[PDB]
């Protein structure tokens, strides 16, 4: 098997970096420009290295609010997994340091913007266009599941577009190395798996559930389960009934039924062949899986670029002051970071 | 017009 030697060689490089362990650089060496995104624990800005001149995407996390919400386990897993993995569809990490008040991570800047901002403007992507992006998630999940890793957060808000129209997966805040089961509640309400809501101890099969919700939102323009209150969305997820649009192809409908199967016995990705069932499907018939990994397939849509450092493909936000105190905030907790 | 509201992640 060709991919078996690939996943065996990839599991040797990942575990070598997994035990290689901090404070690569410092905040004084960056020029903050504009904010690219915001979250509950911090924001993501566009920074330029004052000396090297390269533009980067600095992710800031407040050390006090993370401790106040018991997110130290998820914080250490985001940094420990990012710098260890190596895949063309995963975002790259450069510098990781910390000061008195905030944790900092410096990633590869992806100026093409989110898939959310591009999907919401067009309305919906065509099935060949959707098959192009859906094929990259298959090879990415295949690589991550071989390392006993789970993502638990697949949504257009965490999928970026590079200079060649390919996907750059970011936001590893919910990544975790799990062999067996895990019992942590996390994800996106419109993308949560049924067993995650039922507190049933889920495995790597929840990433395949979010894959079906992702393809449905790209080909239609809305998730199959959505409403005002999150309790209304949960009533649709655990129900197991899905209403498909009319413009869907029947091969797309059948693949979504096998992926959105609330029954773990008949859900794709978690069977005998596993990921092989998704590649040999009638939908991914003309898909060149090797050329997708080699980035040789032509991109159907490439975003507009004004050079490195162009925040045109990112929505505007309100700028604030980066608050860095003089006192060390929870220094004993963030030591392995 | 289009109000592109981004979805956040739920914890706890
Ligand atoms: N490398 C990057 N290049 C460009 N934009 C980025 C990059 N990393 C993050 N962003 C942007 O920053 C936003 C927030 O980053 P994210 O990693 O999702 O933080 P977050 O708090 O975990 N978001 P969420 O967990 O979904 O509530 C993303 O939606 C992107 O728009
Ligand atoms: Mg996000
Ligand atoms: Mg996150």
Numbering used by the authors:
A (entry chain A): 13 to 33, 35 to 350
B (entry chain B): 8 to 19
Quote the study that presented this structure, word for word.
Here we present the crystal structures of PKAc in complex with a peptide corresponding to residues 8–22 of WT PLN, at 2.1 Å resolution, and the R9C variant of this PLN peptide, at 3.4 Å resolution. In the structure of the PKAc complex with PLN R9C, the NTR diverges from the structure of WT PLN bound to the enzyme. The mutation to Cys abolishes the interaction between the positively charged side chain of Arg9 and the negatively charged helix dipole at the C-terminal end of helix 4 from PKAc and a hydrogen-bond between PLN Arg9 and the main chain of PKAc Arg134, which releases the NTR of PLN from binding to the large lobe. R9C turns the NTR counter-clockwise by 26° around the hinge formed by Ala11 and shifts the Cβ of residue Thr8 by 5.2 Å. The surface area of the enzyme–peptide interface decreases by 62.9 Å2, as a consequence of the R9C mutation, which is predicted to strongly diminish the binding of PLN. The structural change in the NTR allosterically affects the conformation of the catalytic center. The Cα of Ser16 is shifted by 0.7 Å, which results in a conformational change of the side chain of Ser16, a displacement of AMP-PNP, and a subsequent ~0.4 Å increase in the distance between the γ-phosphate of AMP-PNP and the hydroxyl group of Ser16. The KD value of PLN R9C is about fourfold higher than that of WT PLN. This difference confirms that the loss of interactions between the NTR of the peptide and the large lobe of PKAc is linked to a decrease in affinity for PLN R9C. The kcat values for both PLN variants remain relatively unchanged, suggesting that the increased distance and altered orientation between the hydroxyl group of Ser16 in PLN R9C and the gamma-phosphate of AMP-PNP do not significantly impact transition state stabilization during catalysis of phosphate group transfer.
